[PDB]
Write a protein that binds this DNA or RNA. Structure first.
Ligand code: ZN
Ligand code: ZN
Ligand code: ZN
Ligand code: ZN
Lengths: 195, 193, 196, 192
DNA sequence: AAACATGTTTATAAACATGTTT
DNA sequence: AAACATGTTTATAAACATGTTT
């Protein structure tokens, strides 16, 4: 299984989320001390990338899902069959109906599965912020609820975004739990009460 | 052309269907069958004069709401592809309604309407019995995402002639779920408005 | 392959049967004819009647072997549970291997055997014709583990396979019957009868 | 010698035992009802600190005189089972085990053949009034081959580093399948 | 024999978790 | 959001099966 350990690296690589509009019906929200994303299915979710020094030639940013619990870590993460086949979300998407993770607003994006692992992930060429901007925004879409039967089956997962060299070297990586549900607002308020 | 009818029609042979926290339960006041997925479901048929020769009983599911009638009812992709319930089995894996215990049961998909249904040759009751029994199994919960997506359905059981002329028709709403008992009691308290 | 339980009267019209089952409510054993099933308490002796219409061969013998009733289990040797195999109780000064489920009492020539390859256990007795004026040869069998014995039969129904053989193991006839070793044969048998 | 004593003896340190479902304890019948191998929390209480190598021994013994002379052990079935016996420091025969303590030491008297398990005594956590020991019982009271439904007592003894008994408390233990059911049973049974 | 004892199974019912509708 | 809807998981109680005691 792939590594899920925070490694800032040579470019002080960092992933973060802008203000999570706590306005009750927020399409997504992020608990900072739970290191957890609560996101509605398919809704666009913006991620902030910061680097302390410019990364290499054609570096890239990959996002890969994986289960949190040890008993499952071995199993790939993809869209439950019902969602892989249904008409919605698939209309005419340049992504494979299997991949739980999609990127938005970036035609240079490229999806991929590994023959040896059969692990699914999406890659995007790194691109420095625009003038007077501190972050580089990547737009993500999560295609299955974390409770789809025949898929995540209510099994927690976590996103492992990593920065890499044009040819695979791991320049840095960060991770956060991701619960893609219907009421990120409620499911977060509640999780913050279990303690 | 139009969506299959759902109006009760006893017909020349006075054709009628009826039912005898168990596997299922049937509300007569709501004419609605509550039942667990894939569990066996006994339906009693009754005629007052013998149907013709190759007379058959066909069961077809159709959405209840006008908003959905035109869409064929089928199993959700999950279940249609799952090995569970489809291993040793002659029913095409997509058909919602199957009938167990009758080798002559034939499943059919309309070549033009795309609609699916299962027939069973008509056979009078056993001697000293007043009811011919048919055993249905329903293969998807009403709530199956990808399938019924919780849209209610009607079961249209129709007595026909060897060559598909309808001679009788009875209909009932079917709610395949995990807790027929609970849910039925819910619907019953709901009208206790 | 898992030993044959097919009824086969053979050339000598081999047949096993039971005398009065004395119901008594407290019998040490009882036998249902309609269920072909023997009910009997652990270790209590069990008289079984053998009949033949023509004398069997020379070294002709009678072997009794337990085997599981259900296909799902038929491949597992039937033996005593560890508890009873290790216990001093019943193994006191017996000539019989402590692991063997079926024993025979009142016969010095009785001989226990484990198949080197199959590892199956059985007990044989040299067949002897009945005493003068008696129609049946009698064989006293003992069953050393209840059925519900944990780590042993663990409530898995068995069948006993009594067989008539030639001195050299050729089967001359074979009969079978289920065998439920319990504490209240009277109750359990009535139970099975109401059940139907 | 004679069979191990079972009379409560608080002793110089006011040694006492108590209990705060997988288990339940009847105070009127001084009896513990609990499921097999499941974890059992027992609360030790003293009023002054015991000596140095002070230990807490737990030893099981038959309740009835008809059986006291017999050592209480696991039935051959469980003793030989892979179940509960895989990675274990406790001998597979020992009925009582202690979980959550690497210092726990199992002993079998060379002469009496009796088996128990000791745990070094350590005072409660700061702000806590009780030292807690976690015990596991590896056979059902009913195990054929073993207890064979014969009732047993648990003799928890506070001892000197060299085994001189300093304190002693006892309680009957019934390891069964439904502690709730059985306790209610005995309870209704005496209410008669 | 009748009543009890005691580990397993079966049945019922709440409590959960989480998506949709009012 | 507040309420509901609807499959799962947990908790409880009965019912069983079967050996012992009275
Ligand atoms: Zn999905
Ligand atoms: Zn389905
Ligand atoms: Zn045994
Ligand atoms: Zn045991």
């Amino acid at each position: 299984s792939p590594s899920n350990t925070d490694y800032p690296g040579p470019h002080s690589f960092d992933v973060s989320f802008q203000q999570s509009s706590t306005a009750k019906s927020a399409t997504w929200t992020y608990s900072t001390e739970l290191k957890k994303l609560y996101c509605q299915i398919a809704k666009t979710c913006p991620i902030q990338i910061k680097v302390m020094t410019p990364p290499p030639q054609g570096a890239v940013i990959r996002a890969m899902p994986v289960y949190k619990k040890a008993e499952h870590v071995t199993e790939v993460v993809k869209r439950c069959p019902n969602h892989e086949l249904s008409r919605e979300f698939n209309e005419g998407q340049i992504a494979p109906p299997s991949h739980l993770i999609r990127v938005e607003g970036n035609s240079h994006a490229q999806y991929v599965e590994d023959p040896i692992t059969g692990r699914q992930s999406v890659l995007v060429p790194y691109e420095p912020p625009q003038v007077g901007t501190e972050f580089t925004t990547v737009l993500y879409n999560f295609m299955c609820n974390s409770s789809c039967v025949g898929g995540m089956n209510r099994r927690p997962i976590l996103i492992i975004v990593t920065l890499e060299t044009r040819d695979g070297q791991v320049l840095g990586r960060r991770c956060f739990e991701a619960r893609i549900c219907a009421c990120p607002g409620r499911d977060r308020k509640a999780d913050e009460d279990s303690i």
